[PDB]
From TrEMBL, chain B:
Organism, scientific name: Oryctolagus cuniculus (Rabbit)
Residues of the full protein shown: 46 to 74 of 233
Family: Belongs to the universal ribosomal protein uL2 family.
Domain of life: Eukaryota
Quaternary structure annotation from Swiss-Prot or TrEMBL: Component of the large ribosomal subunit. Interacts with CRY1.
Protein name in UniProt: Large ribosomal subunit protein uL2
RNA sequence: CCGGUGAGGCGGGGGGGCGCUCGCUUCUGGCGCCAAGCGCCCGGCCGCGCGCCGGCCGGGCGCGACCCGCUCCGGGGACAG
């Protein structure tokens, strides 16, 4: 399936594709509020592994924290 | 006269060239400025006090 | 082709519907606890009140603290079948509300006082 | 006469210091809400930044004339929707013992919707044509897929709009669509479509891998640098030549 | 990252012309908005009647008020932080 490919892509963060995507996502998230509701999981495979299921009643939120 | 400030201030009324209204600004009065005097501001404004 | 006349972007006014509940929050409305009998506690029979009734053609009652002068006037009218000119109220230094009920010149305070029983 | 002499003209001089300016169009100077500015600035960044070829590949989308033929073929093999599955089930139930219904008959060919299913039948060399949407919100869903299709020898194409692709199925959106099998009536049309598709994507995949896309400055900066370059050329353009 | 604003005319192009130049304003303690003109249409009434003809009443659109654009304008900047 595609989930194995997605996981293997996400393991290669140092690659140009992943670093470009991460930089764009980080800029977009930094332009938003510290705590807002995200409509869909950014990483469906990771969410499925952690227990998220595409059913009504499942909600995700994106939270920004100071390092 | 502005309290706490030695220099006097001058109230200058303009007209906004977008809406029918009179804008008012509070400039710092220079020497020789008197009431009822036309003061200009812009790139093409002349070199007067 | 709708031009932005002003440089400001304000929130557009969206349609808002009136509440149409499927069920009432409570089964029945609350019965009023300030009926015409609860507002008027008892008439005052003091010597000052007696002189007030005899001379000023008024009546003195002890009223619930939550009652208004309109409520007092309507309660007196419904109870004693009388018409009231004006009502003056005060709060006694004991927690009870005292109201002077001025009677119309057509009726007499002494007669209604005899009818109610105080004298 | 039809003209009343009282009719004057009264022109307006829309200059500086004259009567107030007219209510012109100010769409460029509106303080937009933060989300509009964000969604425009992310497109601006995508234009500015050196997009790697894996993401830049989906910018090359199939043209309109081939896309409409692809949709015409796909409309024939639309999957069964609601109100039709129940009808088929009722037809099979009423014919359980009415006309000797064994129900082995046939499952007609249909499209494939999910990324998982399409990938699974691409790794098995079961698909013949794969259509991939270009505007998936997480691009990570389809990055490997063109490379996998090229490796497995399955022709692939990129179509405008995930909503348009997902309208073939009865849902809001769909990432990809694969033709596992087609009827003998439309086999020639499918062959022509795959011949046209594979001469733009499969055989040129090396160029796509080497084709980075981006590094395009804004019109103001481009115009400024062009003016500077023109002045630099004018320094020695007619003096020598 | 900083400043201004009700984020109101920023960058290119030829339109405009008195002669690069401007959106055309400097003798004075006046006034200046919610369009005039032009052109193309719509509905109702009336007479010619071939009616996108004319008269009355009420409206719509464009020029007037140029076109296209990808960051609101500027100032810093791979550095302040």
């Amino acid at each position: 399936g595609a989930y194995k490919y997605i996981q293997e892509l996400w393991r290669k963060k140092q690659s140009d594709v992943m670093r470009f995507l991460l930089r764009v996502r980080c800029w977009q998230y930094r332009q938003l509020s510290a705590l807002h509701r995200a409509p869909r999981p950014t990483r469906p495979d990771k969410a499925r592994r952690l227990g998220y299921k595409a059913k009504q009643g499942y909600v995700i939120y994106r939270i920004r924290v100071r390092r | 006269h502005d309290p706490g400030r030695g220099a006097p201030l001058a109230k200058v009324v303009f007209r906004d060239p977008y809406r029918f209204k009179k804008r008012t600004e509070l400039f710092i009065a220079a020497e020789g400025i008197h009431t009822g005097q036309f003061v200009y501001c812009g790139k093409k404004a002349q070199l007067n006090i | 082709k709708k031009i932005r006349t002003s440089p400001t972007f304000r929130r557009p006014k969206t349609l808002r519907l009136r509440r149409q509940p499927k069920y009432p929050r409570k089964s029945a409305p609350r019965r009023n606890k300030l009926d015409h009998y609860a507002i008027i506690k008892f008439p005052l029979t003091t010597e000052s009140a007696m002189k007030k009734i005899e001379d000023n053609n008024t009546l003195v009652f002890i009223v619930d603290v939550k009652a208004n002068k309109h409520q007092i006037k309507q309660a007196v009218k419904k109870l004693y079948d009388i018409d009231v000119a004006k009502v003056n109220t005060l709060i006694r230094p004991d927690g009870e509300k005292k109201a002077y009920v001025r009677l119309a010149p057509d009726y007499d305070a002494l007669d209604v006082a005899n009818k109610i029983g105080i004298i | 006469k039809v003209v009343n002499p009282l009719f004057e003209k009264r022109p307006k001089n829309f200059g500086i210091g004259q009567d107030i300016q007219p209510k012109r169009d100010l769409t460029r100077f509106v303080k937009w809400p933060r989300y509009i500015r964000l969604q425009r600035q992310r497109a601006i960044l995508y234009k500015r930044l050196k997009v790697p070829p894996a993401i830049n590949q989906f910018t090359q989308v199939l043209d309109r004339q081939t896309a409409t033929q692809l949709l015409k073929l796909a409309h024939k093999y639309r999957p069964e929707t609601k109100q039709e599955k129940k009808q088929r089930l009722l037809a099979r139930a009423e014919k359980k013992a009415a006309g000797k219904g064994d129900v082995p008959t046939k499952r007609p060919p249909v499209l494939r919707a999910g990324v998982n299913t399409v990938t699974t039948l691409v790794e098995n060399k079961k698909a013949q044509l794969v259509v991939i949407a270009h505007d998936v919100d997480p691009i990570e869903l389809v990055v490997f897929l063109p490379a996998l299709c090229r490796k497995m020898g399955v022709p692939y194409c990129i179509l405008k709009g995930k909503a348009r692709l997902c309208r073939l199925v009865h849902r809001k959106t769909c990432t990809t669509v694969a033709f596992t099998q087609v009827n003998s009536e439309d086999k020639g049309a499918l062959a022509k479509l795959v011949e046209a598709i594979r001469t733009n994507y499969n055989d040129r995949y090396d160029e796509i891998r080497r084709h980075w896309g981006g590094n395009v400055l804004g019109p103001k900066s481009v115009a400024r640098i062009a003016k500077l370059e023109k002045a630099k050329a004018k320094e020695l353009a007619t003096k020598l030549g």
